[PDB]
Amino acid sequence: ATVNQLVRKPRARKVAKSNVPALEACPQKRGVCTRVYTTTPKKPNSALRKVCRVRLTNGFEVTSYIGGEGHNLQEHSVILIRGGRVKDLPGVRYHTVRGALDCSGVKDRKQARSKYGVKRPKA
Amino acid sequence: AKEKDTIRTEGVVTEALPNATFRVKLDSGPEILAYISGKMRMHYIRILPGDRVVVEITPYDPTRGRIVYRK
Amino acid sequence: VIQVKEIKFRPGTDEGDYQVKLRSLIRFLEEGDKAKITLRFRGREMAHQQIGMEVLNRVKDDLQELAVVESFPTKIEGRQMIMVLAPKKKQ
RNA sequence: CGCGGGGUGGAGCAGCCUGGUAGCUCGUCGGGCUCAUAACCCGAAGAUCGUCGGUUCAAAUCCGGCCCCCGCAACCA
RNA sequence: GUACGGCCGCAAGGUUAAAACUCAAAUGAAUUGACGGGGGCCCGCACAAGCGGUGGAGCAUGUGGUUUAAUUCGAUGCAA
RNA sequence: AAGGCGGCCCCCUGGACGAAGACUGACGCUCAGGUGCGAAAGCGUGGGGAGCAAACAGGAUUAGAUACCCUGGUAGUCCAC
Numbered sequence: 001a002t003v004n005q006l007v008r009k010p011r012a013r014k015v016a017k018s019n020v021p022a023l024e025a026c027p028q029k030r031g032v033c034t035r036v037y038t039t040t041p042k043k044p045n046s047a048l049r050k051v052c053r054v055r056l057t058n059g060f061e062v063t064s065y066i067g068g069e070g071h072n073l074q075e076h077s078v079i080l081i082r083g084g085r086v087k088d089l090p091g092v093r094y095h096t097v098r099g100a101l102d103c104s105g106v107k108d109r110k111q112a113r114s115k116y117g118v119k120r121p122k123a
Numbered sequence: 124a125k126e127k128d129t130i131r132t133e134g135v136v137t138e139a140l141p142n143a144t145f146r147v148k149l150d151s152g153p154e155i156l157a158y159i160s161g162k163m164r165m166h167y168i169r170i171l172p173g174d175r176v177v178v179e180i181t182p183y184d185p186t187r188g189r190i191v192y193r194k
Numbered sequence: 195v196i197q198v199k200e201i202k203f204r205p206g207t208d209e210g211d212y213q214v215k216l217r218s219l220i221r222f223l224e225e226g227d228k229a230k231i232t233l234r235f236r237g238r239e240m241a242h243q244q245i246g247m248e249v250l251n252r253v254k255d256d257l258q259e260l261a262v263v264e265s266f267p268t269k270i271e272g273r274q275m276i277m278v279l280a281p282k283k284k285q
Numbered sequence: 286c287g288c289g290g291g292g293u294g295g296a297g298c299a300g301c302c303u304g305g306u307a308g309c310u311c312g313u314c315g316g317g318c319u320c321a322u323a324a325c326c327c328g329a330a331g332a333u334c335g336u337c338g339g340u341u342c343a344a345a346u347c348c349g350g351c352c353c354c355c356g357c358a359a360c361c362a
Numbered sequence: 363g364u365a366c367g368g369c370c371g372c373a374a375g376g377u378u379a380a381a382a383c384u385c386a387a388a389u390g391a392a393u394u395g396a397c398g399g400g401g402g403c404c405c406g407c408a409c410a411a412g413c414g415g416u417g418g419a420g421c422a423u424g425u426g427g428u429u430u431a432a433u434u435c436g437a438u439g440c441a442a
Numbered sequence: 443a444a445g446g447c448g449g450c451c452c453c454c455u456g457g458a459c460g461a462a463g464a465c466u467g468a469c470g471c472u473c474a475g476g477u478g479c480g481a482a483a484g485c486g487u488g489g490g491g492a493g494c495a496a497a498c499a500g501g502a503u504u505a506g507a508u509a510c511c512c513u514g515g516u517a518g519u520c521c522a523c
Contacts, residue, residue, distance in 0.1 A: 198311005
């Protein structure tokens with residue numbers, strides 16, 4: 001409180017701790033698929049959510065979501081990951097970029113295609 | 124859409140894990156983590172550690188399955 | 195004479211809890227009583243293939259020194275199974 | 286011929302060197318408590334005290350045999 | 363109030379004091395209920411005070427159960 | 443000052459408050475670091491030991507009862523450093 005006190009010990013803003021450290025301030029990172037599996041989510045939800053463990057080009061190894069309905073990914077699949085947690089999946093803090101590198105687009109999508117790596121259907 | 128690679132194979136409740144969780148051993152081959160289906164939990168239907176049960180298994184993860192048919 | 199006292203071994207009574215009261219069950223036997231084990235399954239007329247005869251059998255097998263059992267019963271009556279345990283009989 | 290500890294009621298004990306109707310537990314069958322069951326509580330059934338000879342007023346407990354179980358001991362290659 | 367480092371202690375331990383990770387909460391006071399092996403105060407044939415019953419018997423009747431080709435459907439604690 | 447301090451008597455000693463006036467003349471307030479104090483339990487050595495009582499033993503209760511209740515009871519609770 002005292003002026004004297006601040007003069008001895010200045011106000012010191014807290015440094016923000018990141019939510020996607022594996023990215024190291026990069027917009028995406030590349031990595032190899034270590035395990036490709038499903039996992040169940042947290043109260044109150046229930047499903048078999050597709051996730052993968054991915055060793056990134058910078059050594060970090062993280063779990064990443066594989067959004068969309070259907071995917072053709074396996075071990076040694078080289079994928080691109082981006083920031084973005086999965087809320088009912090604790091530990092999951094990244095998303096896989098559908099339709100980049102070895103990851104295919106979602107099949108048969110018509111709405112929100114660009115978020116699922118899907119070309120515009122000839123029509 | 125909802126793909127259709129789901130299955131309904133049966134099995135028997137083995138373990139009585141925590142939070143409506145079970146070891147359910149598929150008559151078929153092995154057993155899976157099996158969690159209690161929402162429906163089923165909403166209609167209660169307790170589930171003893173040794174019942175014949177129906178499972179919904181996504182090829183995506185055979186290791187897991189949902190209990191559909193109560194007993 | 196030889197009395198009937200009793201112990202129970204419910205499911206979820208493993209090593210921890212269990213052999214502490216295998217110590218209790220020695221005590222019963224070692225008074226010179228016939229110490230009757232009662233299982234009390236979360237279960238049925240065939241509750242288990244697990245619940246009972248891990249416990250019971252290992253209670254015998256650990257106590258086997260001092261006590262033996264009359265029978266390894268494995269006929270449950272109700273939702274509970276008595277294994278009967280006695281002093282080890284001098285031939 | 287080779288050691289240990291025991292034999293009591295359906296099962297396991299106490300009553301022992303301190304020799305006068307053998308009592309204490311689990312089971313058994315009833316009764317009580319509960320809406321009911323488990324659990325618990327009041328109770329009754331249940332014995333040549335291994336079997337004999339000795340020994341004594343009367344010996345469960347007193348000695349030694351016959352005999353049995355367990356103990357380790359052993360079938361120790 | 364943990365770890366690592368330092369100082370301290372015979373020891374038990376103390377003192378100074380982080381980060382990763384994880385959640386969208388955690389928290390304070392007050393409000394309306396409900397609940398208390400919770401408590402206070404107060405009412406109702408609730409108890410107490412009485413008179414007559416039901417529970418036993420035979421029959422009427424409803425239900426359950428059992429039976430049947432069918433014994434039609436419904437009502438099920440007080441409130442069938 | 444806080445921790446805490448209770449039979450009675452003496453000895454040594456700290457602080458607080460009141461009355462009156464004299465003296466000193468801002469000698470004051472606060473205080474990181476430093477130093478000292480600091481219930482109970484606990485520790486070390488030697489004493490002491492009635493009552494109480496961790497531990498521990500026995501009796502009960504209980505489905506269990508390493509508890510609550512009972513019969514005992516060691517450290518400790520007491521003194522010096």
